[PDB]
Structure formats: structure tokens, C-alpha cells
Amino acid sequence: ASSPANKVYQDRFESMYSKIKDPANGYFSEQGIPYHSIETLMVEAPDYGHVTTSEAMSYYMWLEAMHGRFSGDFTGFDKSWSVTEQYLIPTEKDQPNTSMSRYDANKPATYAPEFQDPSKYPSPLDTSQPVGRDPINSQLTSAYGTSMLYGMHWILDVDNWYGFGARADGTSKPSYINTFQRGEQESTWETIPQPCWDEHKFGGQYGFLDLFTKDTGTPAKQFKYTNAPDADARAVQATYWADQWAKEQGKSVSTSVGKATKMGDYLRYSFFDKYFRKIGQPSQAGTGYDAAHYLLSWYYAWGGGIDSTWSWIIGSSHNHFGYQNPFAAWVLSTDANFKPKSSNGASDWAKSLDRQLEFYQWLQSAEGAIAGGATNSWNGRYEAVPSGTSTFYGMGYVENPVYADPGSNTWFGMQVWSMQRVAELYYKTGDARAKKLLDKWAKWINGEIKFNADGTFQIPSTIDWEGQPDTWNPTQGYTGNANLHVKVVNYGTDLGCASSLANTLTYYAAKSGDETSRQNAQKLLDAMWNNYSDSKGISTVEQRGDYHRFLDQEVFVPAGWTGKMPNGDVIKSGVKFIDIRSKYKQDPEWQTMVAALQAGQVPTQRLHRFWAQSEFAVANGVYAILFPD
Template identity: 60%
Template sequence: KAYDARFLDLYGKITNPANGYFSPEGIPYHSVETLIVEAPDQGHETTSEAYSYLLWLQAMYGKVTGDWSKFNGAWQIMEKYMIPTHADQPTNSFYNASKPATYAPELDTPNEYPAKLDTSVSVGSDPIAGELKSAYGTDDVYGMHWLQDVDNTYGYGNAPGKCEAGPTDTGPSYINTFQRGAQESVWETVPQPTCDAFKYGGKNGYLDLFTGDSSYAKQWKFTDAPDADARAVQAAYWADVWAKAQGKGSEVSTTVGKAAKMGDYLRYAMYDKYFKKVGNCVGPATCPAGTGKDASHYLLSWYYAWGGATDTSAGWAWRIGSSHTHGGYQNPLAAYALSNNADLKPKSATGQADWATSLGRQLEFYRWLQSNEGAIAGGATNSWAGRYATPP
């Protein structure tokens, strides 16, 4: 009871509007302060990470109080503002799973960009797009974008369903930052709208800062932070367990089902960036393209991303995974929940089996990363330097 009282006291402080943790829409700011040097470059941006911790907070509130409306409400806010709507990702139907994306090398420092697209490098096939479409009846991806300018401070006005509506638009605006290699630090990034209609930036919007191409099309693109989606699944798992213990499992069942769906799409984080074969993948030209699941490392990588043309009459779309995996992004509990909990079983043909494999792989990864000093840190990559270079 003492713990519950302390939790509710802290919960009251966090959720009190006067304390400034939330926007008028109820979106959690990354921090109360606006000056910040972290993953966001401004504190009143928010991250999928913040949404995931809000879900966890509200799951704990349900456990202590028996009121699950706040947990369900947190998922609804996250779904409304941080999971792109169909209008935000309108050309996924043009996606060709046998040619997921065009290769571009990652470079060491921002000044080396733009990175030239290289169509001569073979890219593997995407083995899960078809089964996700048949399971959920849509070509759209159900995952959180990672970064949002909640107060539209940058003025892009890139709200859900809007593309570059401008500085007079109120409410949250989708943005992206990191895109120029491992050395780029937060205040070196170029904040840009996720939907680039060439209204801001240069004649090609912001696209020619990042990739070198002969011509540029207006386009949308989103990036998922897998640790946050996994944490949302983790929160939903505990909500399911705790609500059932109170005889209220039915009150969270719809939300838990959505978490299972999110976990199904989260498998994109298990794939090499360009779906190349995992293991001894050296040389962009010589590392073979993956066929099916041999492009999967079954770990939670840095990101998965997807994008396409804004013009639905001249459509195209792409998807990538990530070759880089870090110890801190893994979530064995989410993998356990998606492979062993009936309420969180993904609808796709192989989702449950993939998460069962991932559970074992993540535990192996922790053991592999355990140093003789005791710390679990670091990670692994299938693409040295982000360009399938020869490792030292």
C-alpha cells in the first residue's frame, strides 16, 4: 500500500497539466524543458520512446486502481498521432517485395553526404510483406514513427494526414533528423518533414542532402525505433496479465490485439538493411542477396523504415531493415509475449514462430555481449561501416 500511494502521488504530479509534461492533445513531451541535447534536439518534440513509457505508466495505473481507461486512452493517442495513417503512407500498394529498396552506402561523416544510390548492388527479397497484407487486409505499415515536433516549432506543419501544411498549423508535426552516418550528432542533424513536397528546403526539398540521384520525386518516409514498439508490446503484455488478474481482461483485449499487430510489423527490425544474407556479409557487390528468412538476424536492430511517392498516380514505395543491432534495444519479454501469450499472438503466418526464434537469439546475444568485466554492452552488425565493408 505504501508503494501504491507513492506511485499515485508521482502519477498525479506527472499528469497534472500545470506541470507541463503533456501537450494540449495529451501527447507526452520528451522533456518539460525545451533546451535538450539528446535524441531530440528540442524538448517539446516527442519520441515513440515517450509514448511507450506513457503506455507502461498507464498499465501500472490500471494495476493499482483497476481503471483501464487510461491505458486504452494512451494507446488511442499514440495510434492517432504517432502511427502514420493511410493518408500519410498512400502508395504502399506499389511496393514490390522482390525489390524492397535501392542500395546507398552509409558514410563516416556528414560532409561526405549525399550518398549515391547504386542500382548495381543486389538487394534481397522481403519475405513478410505478403503475409502481413493477407493477415491485416492492408498495404500500410502499423508501427510508430520515432520523432515528432509536438508544438510545430520548426513550422513544417506535417501533422498526421497533412504534408507540409506550414507554420500556422497547430499540433504535432512529423519530422526526422539523423540521416548522415554514425558520427552525426544531434545538433549537426538537419530537421526535415517526413513528407517532402519541396515546399521547404532547396529545390529538391531536403532529399539531395542525403542521397545523390539524377532526379527527385516528392515523397513520404517514416522510421521506426524498434525498442519503443517492443516496449509498447511489453506494456500491453503486463496490462493483459494484470487486467486478467482483476477479472477485467476484456477491458484491454482490443488494445492488446493492436499490440500484437504492432509486434507483427516489428519483425522488419529483424532484417538486414537491404535484405542481404546474414553472416560474413562482406562487399556490397559480393555479399549475396537474401532469399526469405536468411536475411534475418532475429534481433531488434536500430530501426526499420519505409517510404514512397506522394503522387498516387505515379506510385512507388520502399522498405528497409537495419544491419546494426545494439544490446540496449533488445526486449526478450516482448519476444516472449509475442511467441507465448495467446492474446498477443500475431495474426501473420510466421509471426509467432519468428518471435520464438528471436527470443532465443536475444538471450544468446546477451550472453555473447557479456564481457569478462561483467557489463552487457555493445552490439553487432551485418554491414561493417554501413556499407558492407571489410571488418578489421
């Protein structure tokens, strides 16, 4: 039998759950897939509101798990996994085993440099540059009997708004697409949306392939998918809780546990350097596990031929603290119900758990906030790490890993999303490393929360950094990083971040007994419920400072390259963001947004992001369970 939960906050979860699942609110497509946001005029990570991400799917799982805890019904949770497997994990038709089975573990892929400006692409493939060996592929094929990978592709065109369709048919939905391809300076506004399955039917002469990679001969028809490790790790985290809550009620989600465990087994590909180069000695090809940094890197990707048999797989050299998940690592390495079928699955995750906690501590600033991360590929070309640059196991410190437009660690959100997982670990195991991290971080954040007399509040929004951490010495440990400082540039009322913060403070308070954290967590939840509730969940008016880029952001296209988007939009040098997305002009909010820009004003919006609504719902549920009285 489940333990008693705080009635007030449980009702708040149930109310939010009803608003999110309400057919009249439009959070989901006809196929049952959650959108990034209800509103369509939306540009953040995705460049259209009805395009979805693996992040959203993992939040959908978390939401349904919590619903199972209070209702006793877990069919909704099992359904979230069914939708995930059907639409976000490439099927046998999307990643033909005929090509995947030709994968060569001794030559995983062909090296191509990364550049600091989109105008430097396409990047030339170089078969003469070293590439290490993949030590886990044999483990996976042996355990699962297939060469296909079981992981979520990160972004999906849910209602086929771009027109690529499924496997080049241009009419089916949902449609697998990808955007980011050209380095740290390619913002969401500077991409050229492309299909994952490229048969050269759309775009240019050879599809969109020669916009990104330059090969010796003619570009072959091929497919390619890209994973978002933090999303897959959250799916494991959510499934663990679903399993625990189901068992407390004599229920079972066995089938879903198996899927999560398999996903976690494949997620290990994010532990490796992009081209399997040795960690700390980037110029040398790895011989196996010496190319594993054991952290959840920015991605792992794979692809292969469509009309010819061949395939490749790559990990990632760039690591961001915001993507780590010590809780998922603990689950996969210690819980017997979640033990990966592969020979080294559980043991690799054990090593990752320890490495991840070292990573967090190394990045903890003098104040308490966690800094960016590190990379094993300086400038994305394995260049020499400048002297004086601090390192972590040979990897150079990087203030804003992977992206600089805007800086990947200038958003407060990464702080709460990641520390929330550390709080769950600390609550479950009382781990000393986790406690030390949280004690300092919590003291920092509790001093940055501002409550107004009218019931509204503010928390850090944009942050900046100065200095770097001291080089990591595993035997020395935390030095305090007196020369690493965080600075809060401005405050805001981001309801998604506030909910994640409340969640984090609740788990921490529950275990540590810190009253300051508990009352702040409750005050945030109450303030949002009482002052920001609407018929669709919660929301507030926010300024969209980058929306001017809709009209004035030029998109780079190589000289002489021309093509067309499915709707006829011409792609050629000189086009702006809007020129290759002309359907945006038919959006109900278009005229309003354009009017604002024409008057020299910053557009404003009231947005209902799926992850934010779910985050708030879950935070209420977590408080109800940990503080029943």
C-alpha cells in the same frame, strides 16, 4: 482479485502519477501527447524539449498500465493507445496505400552506402548493387488487408515548433519530422531537421531530399518514416502487463491487446539486414529468411512517392544489445492472447527470443556489463570484416553500434533499460539463460552503487570498453570473455537510470531471493523519494557539458546547396546549430545558458524528462507488488 501491494510504495506511485498527469505541471500538450521534457531548452536524442519520441509514448503506456493495476481503471491505458495510433502511427493519409501497394517484395529498395563523416553526403543510390527479397510482406498484407505498416515513427514535433506542419501545410500540429540521416558521426548537434512528408515546399529546390540521397534524376516528392524498435517492443511489454492486471480484476483491455499484437507482427521488419543481404555473407543478396539476424536492430524504415506510386522498406544491419527485449519476444511467441495474425509471426518471435539471449551472453564482459553489439554491414557498406575481429553468426563485433558522437554504448542507461527486460523474463519463466546473465551482471552493478552519508547516491554514468568478446560458438557457449572489459569513467546521479536500475534489481531479487539486490533497490527508491522530490516529480541539478555546441558546432551543407527553414532561417555552408533554429533565442532559459558559456562555465539544468519520471513511478509500483511486506 489483485494481490496486496506494499502500501508505502503504492502511495508513492499514486503521488507520482498525480504529478505527471497534473495539467498545471505541463508534461502533456493540449492534444494529450507527452513531451520529451517539461523544459524546452533540451538537447539529447531530440534537439528540442517539446519534440517527443515513440520511447516516451511507450513509457506513457507503461505508466497507465500500472495506474490501472492500483486504481482498477484502465481507460487511461486505452487512451494512451488511442493517442499513439492517432499521432505516431502514420495514418492512411500519411502513408497512402496507393503508393504502399506498389511495393515490390523482390526489390525492397535501392542500395546507398553509409559514410563515417557527414561531409560525404548526399550518398549516391546504386541500382546495380544486390538487394535481397522480403519474405514477410506477403504475410502481413494477407493478414491485415493493407500495404501500410503499423509501427510508430520515432520522433514528432508536437507543437509544430519547426513549422513544417502536417503534410506540408506548415500550420497543423503535431508534425512528423526526422533528424539523423548522415552516419555515425552525425551527432544531435549536426543534423538538419526535415519533414517526413516532403513536397519540396520547405528547404531547398527539392526540399531536403538531395542533402541525404543523390539520385540519377530529379528527386520526387516523397514521404519516409523511421521506427525505433525498442520503443515498439516496450509497448508490447507494457500491454502484456496491462492485460494481466486487468484480468486479475475482471476488467479488459482487449482492443489495446489487438493493437499491440499487430504492432509486434510488423516489428519483425527489424529482424532483417538493411538491404536484405545474407547474414554472415554480406556480398550476397538474401533469398528470404537467410537475411534475418532475428535481433531488434536499430530501425526499419519505409517510404514512397507522394505524386507518383512507388514505395520501399529497409531493415537495419546494426544491432545494439540495448535495444533487445526478450520479454516481448516471449510474449508474442508463447501467449495465446498475443499471437500475431500472420502465418509466421509467433514462430519468428520464438527464434528471436533464443537469438537475443545468445546475443546478450556473447556480449557479457569479464566483469558483467554487456558490450555494444554487432553489424552485418561493416562500415555501413558491406565491406570486409577485418581479420581478428570477433563475430556473432558472421556479424562483426562493434563497440559502439550506429553512433560514435558520443559512443552509443558509453551511457550506463543502456545497461539497465535492456537488463530490466531480462529480469522480467527471468521472473516470469525462471529461464536458466536469463538467470546466468543476471547473476553476473547484478553482482557487477551492486558493487558500483555508492551511498553517501547525507542520503545522496551515485551510480555509473559514463563507461568505456577494452578488447572484444570471443567469437561466438553456439555449441561452446559463454567463454567468460576474459579479454572484454568495462571501465566506469565517471559516476553521477541520473534519476532515470537509477529508477530503471531499481526496477531491474527488484524483479531479479523477487525471483532469486538475493537480499543485496533487494535492499539496494529499496535504498535507491527511498533516497530518490526523500532527497530529490519536487512539486513536479523528482529532479536534480546536472551539468550539460555539450551545450557549448549550441554556438560552436558547424553544420555541414553541400557546396552550392541553399535553402530556408519554415521560419526563414537560411541553410547554407557555414551555419551553426543555432543558425537554423533561431527560435531557440526566445526560450526563457536562453539568456541564462548563454551567460554561462560566456563566463567559461558549464551550463547546469534541473530537468524533468517524461521517461525518467515515469520510470521512477513504475519502479515504485513494481516494488510495491513484488515486496508487499
